Paper text:
Herein, we have chosen to use an extracellular dye-type heme peroxidase found in Streptomyces lividans and referred to as DtpAa. The overall structure reveals a ferredoxin-like fold typical of dye decolourizing peroxidases with two DtpAa monomers in the crystallographic asymmetric unit. Heme enzymes catalyse many essential reactions in biology and understanding their structures throughout their reaction cycles is of high interest, prompting extensive efforts made to obtain ‘intact’ structures at high resolution. A major challenge is to obtain the higher valence states of these proteins, for example peroxidases (FeIII resting state and FeIV intermediate states), as these states are phenomenally sensitive to reduction in synchrotron experiments caused by the presence of large numbers of solvated electrons or other radiolytically produced species, generated by the interaction of X-rays with the crystal.
To produce an ‘anchor’ structure of DtpAa, i.e. resting state ferric, free of any effects of the X-ray beam on the structure, we used the SACLA XFEL beamline BL2 EH3 to perform SFX with an X-ray energy of 10 keV, a pulse length of 10 fs with a 1.25 × 1.34 µm beam and a pulse energy of 289 µJ pulse−1. The chip was translated between apertures in the 33 ms separating the 30 Hz XFEL pulses, with a single image recorded at each position. The SFX structure was determined to a resolution of 1.88 Å from a total of 72 615 indexed and merged diffraction patterns [Fig. 2(a), Table S1]. The refined model exhibited a mean-determined B factor of 34.7 Å2. The heme Fe is six-coordinate with residue His326 acting as the proximal ligand with an Fe—N bond length of 2.19 Å (we note here that monomer B appears to be inactive and is consequently not discussed further). The distal heme coordination site is occupied by a well defined, full occupancy water molecule (W1), bound to the Fe at a distance of 2.40 Å. A number of further, well defined water molecules occupy the remainder of the heme distal pocket [Fig. 2(a)]. W1 is hydrogen bonded to a second water, W2, at a distance of 2.68 Å and also interacts with the charged side chains of Asp239 (2.92 Å) and Arg342 (2.74 Å). Interestingly, the side chains of these two amino acids are only 3.13 Å apart (Arg Nη1 to Asp Oδ2) suggesting a charge-based interaction. A linear fit to the data yields an intercept (i.e. extrapolated to zero dose) of 2.37 Å, which is very close to the value in the SFX structure (2.40 Å) at comparable resolution and within the experimental error for this bond length in the room-temperature structures.
Author numbering:
A (entry chain B): 56 to 417
B (entry chain A): 55 to 416
The structure:
Amino acid sequence: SAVPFHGAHQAGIATPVQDRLHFAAFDVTTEDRAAFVALLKEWTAAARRLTAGHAVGEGAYGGLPEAPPDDTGEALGLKPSRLTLTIGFGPSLFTRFGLADLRPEALADLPKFPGDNLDRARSGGDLCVQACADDPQVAVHAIRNLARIGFGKVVVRWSQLGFGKTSSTTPDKQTPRNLLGFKDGTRNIAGTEKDRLDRFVWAAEKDGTPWMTGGSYLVARRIRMHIETWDRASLQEQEDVFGRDKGEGAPVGKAKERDEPFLKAMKPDAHVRLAHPDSNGGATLLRRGYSFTDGTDGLGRLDAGLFFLAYQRDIRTGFVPVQRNLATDALNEYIQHVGSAVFAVPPGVRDADDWWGSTLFG
Amino acid sequence: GSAVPFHGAHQAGIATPVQDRLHFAAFDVTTEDRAAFVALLKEWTAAARRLTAGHAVGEGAYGGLPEAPPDDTGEALGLKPSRLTLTIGFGPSLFTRFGLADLRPEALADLPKFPGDNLDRARSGGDLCVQACADDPQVAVHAIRNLARIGFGKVVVRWSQLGFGKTSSTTPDKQTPRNLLGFKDGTRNIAGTEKDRLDRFVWAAEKDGTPWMTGGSYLVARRIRMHIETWDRASLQEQEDVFGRDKGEGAPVGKAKERDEPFLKAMKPDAHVRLAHPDSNGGATLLRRGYSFTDGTDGLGRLDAGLFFLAYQRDIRTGFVPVQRNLATDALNEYIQHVGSAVFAVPPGVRDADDWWGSTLF
Ligand code: HEM
Ligand code: HEM
């Protein structure tokens, strides 16, 4: 029911994937480094309470009548619901507070990729908070109260709600399906694979940026799906796009979802074949994304897709080579990348006296 | 994760326990062929039987001819029914078509202008609606998406609204949920067990003057934006004064327990509960069944937040209209704005496997 907040690493990366997401990018409006550090400390105090299912500050009620309550109250009576709060720092943060020479080289700007149609207003950001929980109101409450605590020092640049599986009704070892109807997550780095996490996800001291040791790098892409076009494709076209069948999710020519793929049996521009580590010099990613459905656009089409999140030890050797290799992906006909951001996710909060960003700000 | 029975004298999704998630879609009709529209209603009813039982529509999501699109888009495969209910309604504009003019119920009244309205016409109205409620958002989206696909060329989605969490209750024996202002919302509603009150206030009766509507209800939908910046800087006393209940327990002012009966004379004259209470409106009583929403940011550095208000009633003229008229002096008006609106006639239930949505009208 709760996930420990403290550790060598931030929670919400290798910890079990929760049913819901509220992801928010913030822009910083203060130039005062001391005021920003103060905020990080207050945010960390609030996060400790939130992830344990307690209200922030003095609480949501019972205080002075003439004062606004410290907590806005909409999570009263709810459980912690495995809430994790994961903070990250965008490249643009390092132009402030004299941090320019502390930007990690692994926090690389992404190139323009073919077919990008990025909405500037739903891209970038000085920092992010990823709120994952099994109850979406727990996640929203966390973001709403962090933004309220930060008011005057940060503003919300963009936000995205997402959903995965509903654990109360769906088994844990069942692979969830994305909104194209295919199982999504079969060949991924699991949180149990400590060695693969050290190799592919966690920043190491020898990587060149000491304050990031134990952190990770996050790529976020809001990927719209062209639902109505996809739904008019034949079953064979859909399966040819991925290289797996739709019902079982087995690789072509195999029987079971978890059978290892035979890449030469897939079409040359099939998604799995292009994204597989063997096709990318061994590049391997921790995918931790969520489906979204925001409504319908002005043409009646479903505004839906995948809020893709990938964690890696170095953006240059993780997301960039794989996404570059998708230049000819058969899936490109049915998707469009419309938002993007990258973040350096710092190491964990070690104990009750530590605070978000302490290794960077000291 | 269980199924809610689809057949009955009334449609499910009204008196039914309120499910965690909402996907509401309003459709406009694009065909002038009454026969083709009746055929759609029958095909939609057949799909709804499958969907509410947790089965795929038509011949299924895979295993068909490779060269044909699958009958079901597949993203709900392996999921439980999740208490999915599908509730159809007919908007007043529908009755300008198919020779239905003289069948428009008088109880399906157009709403007057209310002070403070700022209604977006694009996200208002609609020839018909489908309310999809379920505990699993993927199940709800799947249902809307597949109904829309089946209806291609005969209906188009006009607007849609997702609700990430309920703000209503038809089960007073379960915990009352909170809206994004942090107050319990749903304490004094109509419970699904209160058969006499549902007959008096919710279900249309033959004697009311429209026989085809016997057993149905009337639905008002209002999209309400919340000014959370303004609210969140108000004092606790101000917030509690606005409603007439305390924030922590949700008891009427002066009393100890949520479900103690309000003593209205102890509330401020402009308190929401005092103004909305049946005793202040000649006995007018509503079944409220709304959900919270957030659609990103407002572009001004803040989270967007609202309440998608849904009310069912026996006659719009004796339910929503008098109550909302009495809210002209509501203290809550300082913190909300109605920005979308629609009314629908919700026909009687689908009696058995031979029946179909709208059969008593057509
Ligand atoms: C809407 C967009 C996308 C959809 C629907 C999608 C869907 C899928 C599916 C169905 C699979 C096979 C099952 C699995 O192993 O998870 C898969 C695998 C994979 N995808 Fe995607 N994907 C999308 C975007 C991306 C992007 C943007 C990247 C990276 C830049 C990516 C990288 C991968 C990787 C690495 C695998 C595993 C390949 C393997 O090792 O077998 N995907 N994806
Ligand atoms: C964002 C908008 C609104 C919010 C935050 C809100 C909030 C509340 C709250 C906190 C209660 C007290 C607990 C309860 O009995 O449910 C309440 C009661 C009630 N509300 Fe609202 N409400 C809103 C809009 C409306 C509207 C538009 C109507 C009808 C036109 C309405 C009608 C009622 C009724 C009939 C009651 C029960 C009064 C009683 O019999 O005691 N509300 N509302």
